[PDB]
Amino acid sequence: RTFLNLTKPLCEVNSWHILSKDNAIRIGEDAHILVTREPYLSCDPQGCRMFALSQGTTLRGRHANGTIHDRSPFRALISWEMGQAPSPYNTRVECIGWSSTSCHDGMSRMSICMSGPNNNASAVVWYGGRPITEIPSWAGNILRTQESECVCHKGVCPVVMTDGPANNRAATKIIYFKEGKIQKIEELAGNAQHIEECSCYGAGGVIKCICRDNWKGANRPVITIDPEMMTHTSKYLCSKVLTDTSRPNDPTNGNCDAPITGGSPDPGVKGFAFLDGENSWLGRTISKDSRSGYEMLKVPNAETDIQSGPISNQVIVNNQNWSGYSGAFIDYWANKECFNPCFYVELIRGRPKESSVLWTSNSIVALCGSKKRLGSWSWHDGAEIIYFE
Amino acid sequence: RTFLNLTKPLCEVNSWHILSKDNAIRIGEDAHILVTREPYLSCDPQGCRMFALSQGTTLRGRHANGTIHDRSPFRALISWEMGQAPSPYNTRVECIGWSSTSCHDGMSRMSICMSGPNNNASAVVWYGGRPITEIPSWAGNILRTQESECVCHKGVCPVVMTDGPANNRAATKIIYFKEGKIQKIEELAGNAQHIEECSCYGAGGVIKCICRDNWKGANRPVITIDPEMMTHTSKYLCSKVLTDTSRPNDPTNGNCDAPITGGSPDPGVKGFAFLDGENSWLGRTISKDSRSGYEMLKVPNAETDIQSGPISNQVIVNNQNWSGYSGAFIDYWANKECFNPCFYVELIRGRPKESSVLWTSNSIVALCGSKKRLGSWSWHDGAEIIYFE
Amino acid sequence: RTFLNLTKPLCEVNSWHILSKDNAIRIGEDAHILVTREPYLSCDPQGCRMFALSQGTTLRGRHANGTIHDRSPFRALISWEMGQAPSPYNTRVECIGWSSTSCHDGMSRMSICMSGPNNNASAVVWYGGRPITEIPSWAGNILRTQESECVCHKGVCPVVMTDGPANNRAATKIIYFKEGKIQKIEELAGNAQHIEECSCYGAGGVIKCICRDNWKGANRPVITIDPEMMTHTSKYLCSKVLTDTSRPNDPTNGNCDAPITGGSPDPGVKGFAFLDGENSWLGRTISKDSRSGYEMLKVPNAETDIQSGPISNQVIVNNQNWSGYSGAFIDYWANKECFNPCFYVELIRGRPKESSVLWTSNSIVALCGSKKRLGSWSWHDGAEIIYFE
Amino acid sequence: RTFLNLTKPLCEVNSWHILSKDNAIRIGEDAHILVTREPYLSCDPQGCRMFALSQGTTLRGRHANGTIHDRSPFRALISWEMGQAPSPYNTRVECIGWSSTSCHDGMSRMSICMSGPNNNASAVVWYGGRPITEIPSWAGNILRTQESECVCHKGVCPVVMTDGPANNRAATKIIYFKEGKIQKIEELAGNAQHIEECSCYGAGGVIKCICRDNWKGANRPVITIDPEMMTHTSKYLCSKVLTDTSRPNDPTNGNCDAPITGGSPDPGVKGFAFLDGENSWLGRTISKDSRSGYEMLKVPNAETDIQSGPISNQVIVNNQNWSGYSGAFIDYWANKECFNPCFYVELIRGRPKESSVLWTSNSIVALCGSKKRLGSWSWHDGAEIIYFE
Ligand SMILES: *[C@@H]1O[C@H](CO)C(O[C@@H]2O[C@H](CO)[C@@H](O[C@@H]3O[C@H](CO[C@H]4O[C@H](CO)[C@@H](O)[C@H](O[C@H]5O[C@H](CO)[C@@H](O)[C@H](O)[C@@H]5O)[C@@H]4O)[C@@H](O)[C@H](O)[C@@H]3O)[C@H](O)[C@H]2NC(C)=O)[C@H](O)[C@H]1NC(C)=O
Ligand SMILES: *[C@@H]1O[C@H](CO)C(O[C@@H]2O[C@H](CO)C(O)[C@H](O)[C@H]2NC(C)=O)[C@H](O)[C@H]1NC(C)=O
Numbered sequence A, B, C, D: 001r002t003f004l005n006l007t008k009p010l011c012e013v014n015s016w017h018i019l020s021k022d023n024a025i026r027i028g029e030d031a032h033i034l035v036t037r038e039p040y041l042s043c044d045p046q047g048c049r050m051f052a053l054s055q056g057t058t059l060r061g062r063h064a065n066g067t068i069h070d071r072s073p074f075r076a077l078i079s080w081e082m083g084q085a086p087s088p089y090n091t092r093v094e095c096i097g098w099s100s101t102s103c104h105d106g107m108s109r110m111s112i113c114m115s116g117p118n119n120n121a122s123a124v125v126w127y128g129g130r131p132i133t134e135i136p137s138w139a140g141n142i143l144r145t146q147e148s149e150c151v152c153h154k155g156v157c158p159v160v161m162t163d164g165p166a167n168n169r170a171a172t173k174i175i176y177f178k179e180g181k182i183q184k185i186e187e188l189a190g191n192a193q194h195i196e197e198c199s200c201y202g203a204g205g206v207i208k209c210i211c212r213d214n215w216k217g218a219n220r221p222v223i224t225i226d227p228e229m230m231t232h233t234s235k236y237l238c239s240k241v242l243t244d245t246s247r248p249n250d251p252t253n254g255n256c257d258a259p260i261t262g263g264s265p266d267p268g269v270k271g272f273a274f275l276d277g278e279n280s281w282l283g284r285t286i287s288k289d290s291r292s293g294y295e296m297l298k299v300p301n302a303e304t305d306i307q308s309g310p311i312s313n314q315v316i317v318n319n320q321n322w323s324g325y326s327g328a329f330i331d332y333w334a335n336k337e338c339f340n341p342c343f344y345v346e347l348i349r350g351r352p353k354e355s356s357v358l359w360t361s362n363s364i365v366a367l368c369g370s371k372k373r374l375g376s377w378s379w380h381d382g383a384e385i386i387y388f389e
């Protein structure tokens, strides 16, 4: 074992192949499947695992009642073998909390959870399954982080965190970790005006994080991080193809340097994009209003050209089905000459959209890049809400 | 440590001993057992494992309703320790799809799943637990493969695949894989007119695949593969003993080079044979019409002799019980001077044969050869359907 | 790793400490616990495991109905980590059948199961978890074995098997195994008139088997095996303290060379003794009629002296509670200068004795020698049968 | 792997961070969770596990009825991976009994359990998963031990055990183990008048145990053990800050050398403190009468100064929520220059306090120190009792 470095280029991607699906809600109708939300995947030299925020109750359990609620002393980050559903019998507790990130540096995994009350939350940073570092809230307002994997280079792993209003200017820091210990802290710099829930991946010695501006913008902020100089810049996706949820119709021109406003009724959702000049893909919900459907759109020069639009699409979840959060990960230990993009989509069931049940949970689907021109179908959740009534 | 070489000859077989039985439906009446179909086993240097295509639901779950249906986005190939029943707690997800194959090359396991819509399925080829290769559909008609184990020699693992009509001429390929990467693709050549669901094994550097002609033959096609040369031939099993389901009565002579047609109402079932001159055995369901009973027939020179008939028979499942698919496997890593034949029978319960239940699923029995003359009995599923009403 | 050699003497025993208890019926009332019977324990260099004959159903399952029945195609030898209850999620299938034995030789574990119809049963012998040898029925009447562990010395593992009447003269053999292969077969010789269900242990290069005579004696037969020469003798336990169940009052004298008859209503139960001069301990059910209670009795020279009586006693299960089978095992790999005797008692719940339920199952308790004078209480099952009604 | 040596000082602690929370009652409402009480945590070179005394029945099981009872043949010490709820499917059985301690010495784990009747209990001492030693009751009155982890130094693991009255002068011993073998046995010396349920840690070659006086004191006895010399002293914690439950209001002065009487209705609860000069912290329930709430109090010189009061506080469980036992553990194998203090709180649910249910159980929370000033919230159990009615 060695520290991962990020000096390979991104792979060429012409379509997306099915990597994994857990069918958690279908299985959780009967077997003992934990209630969750904010899932993702993360890899290490050995393979890949699913991660999510448990609600500290099973789906059929009476305590599922009220699981719409975001933050409780009963939530923890759990991980498990990619593909299986999360039960109390197959899940590792990574840390305790209601907001998380995790990543493997080539040697060991670092996992980070926030917990506590809204005015007094704290992060505990674990490395090798051991607690290393604690960080108190600096702004006293729901200290929080990515909800998807971080990225490490040469032992250095940056993590974007935010503390402050959901609906106004907040205080975002980039913290640089090595073996769970803080190497540097940096205030957000650049033109991104609001930063939440960054989806991050590395390629070519650089880490790109594509985020949620929950304040004003229906276009997504992008933070470029040098993990060697331990510095960063920020701005917005240039493309007119707007990828936040609640968004207006796509304008004729996007805006590299300011939030483009509009959309009703939701201020944001976690999302992602891979930005590689011509080899660029943007994900989004199919609905402009709601967390339903999911589509991948190849938009050459999305990161630099305000006029860029799709040259190809793939429907991942059709617009008759609920989606939710979406984020980036890559298996950096694959036996290839390039880093192949992968993404997951969180498939939210129950409240608020389906309120014939008392709970909110989700399942997971995950896909990676193919150089081939693969056919596709919808990878929706597939559970019958009527079975839970 | 090393690549499996197919050097050894086949062991003499005079009868069949019990290897494993999972009792999955009996257990699944209570415990949390996954709905499945299309099982098989496969071994590696450490031991044997059971495989099946999950339906993404447990047997007692309400989602088990409608599981007669073959293809959905909720199926995946799962594997588990031989003899246990498949639950969400003890299963490994090998890949995502509704047709599969799997084998170990002596170093690592290759696993292959097709998924996607009928007019646009794709294969994802997995090696050592990672996705290596994707293959688009070549004929836009349910790209599909073996549904039992492949076989490797010096790192080369041939896989037989088909795309095209179930009731007409289709497009079959032999794909030769080494570490999940395509070394060669051949089009099917020879006298087999239709090819599905091949059951394969190796001995003395030759791989034989005994398959299902869903188009015409109640005789089974036989593909013979040289994995060094990476070439094949194809024809039909010569014996007058027909082993497909829905077959007519055995004629006076079989045909080596052309289908023996007939029988009603079903076109085919996956089956297998071991072919080694004198030491040749054929499995078939006992009913010539439906998937019930299972028998093993020692049919000397089945592969060469149009007049060859049984000189012994072992009842595996009595004709009062449901069977289903059957397939070949060998423990190539046995401490033995020969490769001993083994097989499984899938014990299908529920629909369409038992319509008092809303689901279709199965359990597994597995047996291997013995030089001795062993007594026997029926190894039927053993669940009571009245319990599920 | 090296072959186990039986070079240590038995440790001195003056009472019995608790080793394990799985509370399988209490736990199986809600959790998913397999119906079992004929349990035992067996150790290897890494530790000890619990073993039993599963009925291929869980205890609360509808298929638990009819589990009084001894032989079916749905039974398998299962082993799990000592002190756990056996559920579908934690048990390894050792082999398939309804009579077993198992032992580790210092390198790998050998397991043996019989399956088949009464007149045509067979043994399959496994070594390192792979099948090695098959042995067909020699007398066409329920080929059967120890139902507790076998013992090895320099890789030679003898096994006692019987084929023939339960109620009359049968054909017993002693089979000498090494790595699953048969080295010698001997027919039973000496004074034991009937042999079943041998509980065997080794100390100082000699193996002793304490068996069940189902035909005549309420005294237990004793086979002495030389694992090196591969020869044996047999007679009866000399002591007047009668240990089989159904048995009459203890007579004034025992008989070394012939059975002591009487008792009602039942012909026999599996049981055991440690036999070592002054250091001799006889288990038996407290009740002389039924399978209730269990007591240990120190009877010096029980083996050789027809007049030997108890000098102390420890109640293991009180006579108000159900017992069942009992048997010998030792951790031959403990860091001790002697081999310390252990035993278990099968704690049978349900039919025939408790007919308010439709099933038969058991739980387990295991205790080992102490050189100390330990207090004791009853280790009865502890499930409340009314919960199951 | 070598013997752990208590060579490092205790870390500076200013605040407590969340380590783990198993949410076992919430999860056990549906999923098959073992009823437990008397939990703790213990670490080894590889990670930390949770430990509890199981009741040999699951939480929703009908046998949960009556689990208020402290002692039965159906209890066992179980260990599981930290963060998980204890189920039949993920727990190791450490030993059998109703009182326990456990600790790892850097090489292997020693685990000790007492079982038996009140007047004839015995301890079994286990090492590396094998039983090594047995200790009979010396006073015929419920031989019993710490209910939390022991501590080892150069292979020598002291354990505090008591035998004799709960409400009068009892007979306490300090037993020094090495690889499960007795090195030395001392009778309690010093001014502690009654000793139960010691919580022990190590720093700079010294072991401190903060115990429970069930007889007269609302202050806590403290034993200071030299593991190299194998000698101890005892007294009471000096501070006016009384930390047993039932206690009176805190007095003007404490008492280092005699119990301080008073409080109602409870004679005692298991508790803990870390004593390190200015860096000293005392746990106690928030309620003086009852096992509700839990608070950490930084009391400089608590160990030497009768007038020492709190300089800071952390609410661990609010006084509207039930707590229970509490105890000390340290990850001695952390990659840190100091030994960092951790503790758990047993969060008791059911009887006697909540008698709309027929059972008594608990969940667990654990926390470790921080040099930081971190915010906090209440880590209550989180289950709704109405759901179990
Ligand atoms: C966010 O959480 C952070 C944690 O870093 C906050 O910080 C804590 O802040 C407090 C000041 O607000 C701390 O307080 C002080 O306590 C010491 C000693 O306290 C104990 O002893 C005295 C005398 O015996 C009692 O009167 C105290 O009674 C308070 O605490 C107990 C719980 O133990 C509670 O049950 C009582 O009702 C009562 O509120 C107590 O037992 C005093 O000498 C001092 O004057 C002051 O009160 C605390 O030390 C500090 N903790 C840590 C850890 O840093 C902050 O409060 C939170 N911020 C926000 C915005 O909420
Ligand atoms: C980046 O990480 C790679 C992958 O390990 C790396 O390593 C190799 O490069 C050297 C020469 O520079 C070799 O000759 C090795 O054969 C290569 N090793 C492997 C395992 O592929 C780079 O050195 C790392 N670069 C930096 C800047 O850290």
Ligand SMILES: *[C@H]1O[C@H](CO)C(O[C@@H]2O[C@H](CO)C(O)[C@H](O)[C@H]2NC(C)=O)[C@H](O)[C@H]1NC(C)=O
Pocket: C014, C015, C016, C311, C312, C313, C314, C315, C373, C374, C375, C376, D119, D120
């Ligand atoms: C506690 O239990 C132990 C063990 O059973 C015990 O010892 C036995 O004593 C009785 C009566 O004196 C006997 O006759 C047995 O032979 C003794 N057995 C052993 C194994 O030593 C004590 O009697 C019991 N002590 C108390 C106080 O009950």
Ligand SMILES: CC(=O)N[C@@H]1[C@@H](NC(=N)N)C=C(C(=O)O)O[C@H]1C(O)C(O)CO
Pocket: A286, A287, A288, A289, A290, A291, A292, A319, A320, A321, A322
């Ligand atoms: C799963 C589902 O029913 N999805 C609806 C979808 N359906 C179709 N286009 N058919 C259309 C939208 C939408 O674009 O508004 O999103 C959904 C919707 O109605 C809302 O979000 C409003 O609450």
Ligand SMILES: CC(=O)N[C@@H]1[C@@H](NC(=N)N)C=C(C(=O)O)O[C@H]1C(O)C(O)CO
Pocket: B287, B288, B289, B290, B291, B292, B293, B319, B320, B321, B322
């Ligand atoms: C399991 C079972 O009972 N199977 C039936 C079998 N049974 C007996 N011969 N007992 C008889 C036949 C048959 O004669 O065609 O095949 C089976 C059949 O499918 C049908 O009869 C019609 O569905």
Ligand SMILES: CC(=O)N[C@@H]1[C@@H](NC(=N)N)C=C(C(=O)O)O[C@H]1C(O)C(O)CO
Pocket: C286, C287, C288, C289, C290, C292, C293, C319, C320, C321, C322
């Ligand atoms: C567990 C239990 O209650 N067992 C009964 C037992 N009970 C008591 N001694 N209390 C009495 C005896 C006996 O000693 O013969 O045997 C048992 C019995 O059922 C029968 O004898 C009739 O079949």
Ligand SMILES: CC(=O)N[C@@H]1[C@@H](NC(=N)N)C=C(C(=O)O)O[C@H]1C(O)C(O)CO
Pocket: D286, D287, D288, D289, D290, D292, D293, D319, D320, D321, D322
């Ligand atoms: C968890 C809970 O409700 N606990 C009660 C709590 N008070 C309140 N939460 N209101 C505080 C006390 C107390 O300080 O004595 O008393 C507790 C109590 O109910 C009893 O002692 C009854 O025996």
Ligand SMILES: CC(=O)N[C@H]1[C@H]([C@H](O)[C@H](O)CO)OC(C(=O)O)=C[C@@H]1NC(=N)N
Pocket: A038, A053, A070, A071, A098, A099, A100, A142, A143, A144, A147, A165, A166, A196, A197, A214, A268, A269
């Ligand atoms: C820390 C936290 O509670 N984050 C919230 C997050 C959120 O409120 C915002 O992004 C607004 O600031 O939104 C959502 C969401 O569904 O929009 C889920 C997250 N839930 C959890 N991570 N548990």
Ligand SMILES: CC(=O)N[C@H]1[C@H]([C@H](O)[C@H](O)CO)OC(C(=O)O)=C[C@@H]1NC(=N)N
Pocket: B038, B053, B070, B071, B098, B099, B100, B142, B143, B144, B147, B165, B166, B196, B197, B214, B268, B269
């Ligand atoms: C890919 C696919 O759906 N294959 C079918 C297969 C089939 O339809 C034919 O062979 C005719 O083309 O038949 C059966 C069958 O039971 O006959 C099950 C297989 N199901 C699954 N593999 N999932």
Ligand SMILES: CC(=O)N[C@H]1[C@H]([C@H](O)[C@H](O)CO)OC(C(=O)O)=C[C@@H]1NC(=N)N
Pocket: C038, C053, C070, C071, C098, C099, C100, C142, C143, C144, C147, C165, C166, C167, C196, C197, C214, C268, C269
């Ligand atoms: C092979 C077989 O069925 N053995 C029987 C055994 C028995 O019948 C005799 O000893 C008489 O010959 O009795 C019992 C018994 O409880 O008496 C259980 C065993 N059950 C099982 N091993 N499965």
Ligand SMILES: CC(=O)N[C@H]1[C@H]([C@H](O)[C@H](O)CO)OC(C(=O)O)=C[C@@H]1NC(=N)N
Pocket: D038, D053, D070, D071, D098, D099, D100, D142, D143, D144, D147, D165, D166, D196, D197, D214, D268, D269
């Ligand atoms: C051996 C035993 O039963 N110990 C009791 C203990 C106790 O009774 C006393 O400390 C008085 O001596 O109190 C408690 C308690 O909740 O107070 C739990 C323990 N229960 C168990 N450890 N099982």
Ligand SMILES: *[C@@H]1O[C@H](CO)C(O)[C@H](O)[C@H]1NC(C)=O
Pocket: A062, A065, A066, A358
């Ligand atoms: C769900 O939770 C609600 C608010 O806490 C409530 O009061 C309701 O009764 C409860 N419902 C069920 C069915 O548990």
Ligand SMILES: *[C@@H]1O[C@H](CO)[C@@H](O)[C@H](O)[C@H]1NC(C)=O
Pocket: D062, D065, D066, D358
């Ligand atoms: C509770 O246990 C007691 C003691 O045996 C009892 O009798 C009662 O019926 C049990 N209650 C239930 C609901 O089982």
Ligand SMILES: [Ca+2]
Pocket: A212, A213, A214, A215, A216, A217, A218, A219, A244, A245, A267, A268, A269
């Ligand atoms: Ca937005």
Ligand SMILES: [Ca+2]
Pocket: B212, B213, B214, B215, B216, B217, B218, B219, B244, B245, B267, B268, B269
């Ligand atoms: Ca056909």
Ligand SMILES: [Ca+2]
Pocket: C212, C213, C214, C215, C216, C217, C218, C244, C245, C267, C268, C269
């Ligand atoms: Ca008898």
Ligand SMILES: [Ca+2]
Pocket: D212, D213, D214, D215, D216, D217, D218, D244, D245, D266, D267, D268, D269
């Ligand atoms: Ca007290």
